[PDB]
């Protein structure tokens, strides 16, 4: 399962 | 250790040709199991391996949502990135993400990963402690400040130590017949005369999985590292890989050469020689 990542 | 789950996300802007394309492929070791492409007629997380198909509707929906959200976030990051580097809106740029976890034979976390590259160059990475960051430059330091302020590393750690390791363990169980099976290489040495004076000895390894392998040629038991031509391990297309190493030897001296093959599906490493 993936993960919601954060904006750089 | 023995297994890894990893996601490889690529966001590429294309000014004048729509919004930045986003693609994400997930792998368990050298086996791809999912893909997502914002350019698909109807973008959704889809199975690319048999053992993942058993996951329910809820699994596919949640991951489709996670990737639609990552598509939006990478588009926002590409915009930010352009500003960090004082770049114009006219050029095409790439943001890649590589994240996941590795587990030992006992299934416990060996290490987590969460790193980024902008235009092919390392940008920022979560350190092995899953608590701090390494920024490659002053633009990445802006990202670092922001992530530190929002305590982002804590969330990543929670994912990498829990959710991630749990999924990998579940995939390993569901796809054990292939994921946990090492197919040893089928090996042989070919011989190709170049002139009356030299011939090429090529040592082959085919049908092996996983991709990790070492092929080395020795002359009189001495490694021929500088004189060996090695091609990059390549996918055969049936989940297995192939590779070869060649050496140009003087005619009549072929028997002084031996190829050594090391692969985890081999009980003991092989030693081969050209058998005319």
């Amino acid at each position: 399962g993936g993960k919601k990542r954060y904006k750089l | 250790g023995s297994h890894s789950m990893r996601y490889f996300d690529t966001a590429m802007s294309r000014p004048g040709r729509g919004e930045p394309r986003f693609i994400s492929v997930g792998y368990v070791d050298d086996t791809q199991f999912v893909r997502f492409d914002s350019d698909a007629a109807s973008p959704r997380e889809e199975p690319r391996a048999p053992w993942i198909e058993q996951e329910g509707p809820e699994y596919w929906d949640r991951n489709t949502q996670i990737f639609k959200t990552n598509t939006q976030t990478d588009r926002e990051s590409l915009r930010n990135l352009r500003g960090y580097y004082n770049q114009s809106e006219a050029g095409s740029h790439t943001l890649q993400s590589m994240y996941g976890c590795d587990v030992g034979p006992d299934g416990r976390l060996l290490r987590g990963h969460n790193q980024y590259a902008y235009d092919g160059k390392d940008y920022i990475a979560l350190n092995e402690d899953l608590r701090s960051w390494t920024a490659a430059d002053t633009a990445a330091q802006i990202t670092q400040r922001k992530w530190e302020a929002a305590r982002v590393a804590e969330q990543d750690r929670a994912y990498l130590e829990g959710t991630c390791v749990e999924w990998l363990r579940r995939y390993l169980e569901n796809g054990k017949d292939t994921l946990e099976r090492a197919d040893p290489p089928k090996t042989h040495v070919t011989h190709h005369p170049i002139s009356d004076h030299e011939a090429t000895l090529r040592c082959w390894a085919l049908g092996f999985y996983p991709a990790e392998i070492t092929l080395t040629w020795q002359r009189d038991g001495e490694d021929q590292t500088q004189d060996t031509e090695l091609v990059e391990t390549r996918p055969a297309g049936d989940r297995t890989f192939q590779k070869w190493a060649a050496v140009v030897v003087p005619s009549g001296e072929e028997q002084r050469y031996t190829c050594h093959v090391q692969h985890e599906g081999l009980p003991k490493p092989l030693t081969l020689r050209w058998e005319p």
Binding site: - | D119, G120, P235
Partner: protein, 99 residues
């Protein structure tokens, strides 16, 4: 930065004239990801060519496998034509049954 594609043309199984097989063109080590690959049969483009989902290695360079079912013969020449931003004109690599 930009990296030029490494290219390998080969069959899934050792070639045997008359036996059906798969012709592969594996392009790797390139950046950025836009690349054009055609599998050629006697200079002509093969239309039934599929490819893997874009992925990349630990060093961030991309890799793709393009493939098609084919039956090797003694006469037929096969090749892989690749174009990328790092190349002036398409690079063509001929299939060598022993490579």
């Amino acid at each position: 930065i930009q990296r030029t594609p490494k290219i390998q043309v080969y069959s899934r199984h050792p070639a045997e004239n008359g036996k059906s097989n798969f012709l592969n063109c594996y392009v790797s080590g390139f950046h950025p990801s836009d690349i054009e690959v055609d599998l050629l049969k006697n200079g002509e483009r093969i239309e039934k060519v599929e490819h893997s989902d874009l992925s990349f290695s630990k060093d961030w360079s991309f890799y793709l496998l393009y493939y098609t079912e084919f039956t090797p013969t003694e006469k037929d020449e096969y090749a892989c034509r690749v174009n990328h931003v790092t190349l002036s004109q398409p690079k063509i690599v001929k299939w060598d049954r022993d490579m």
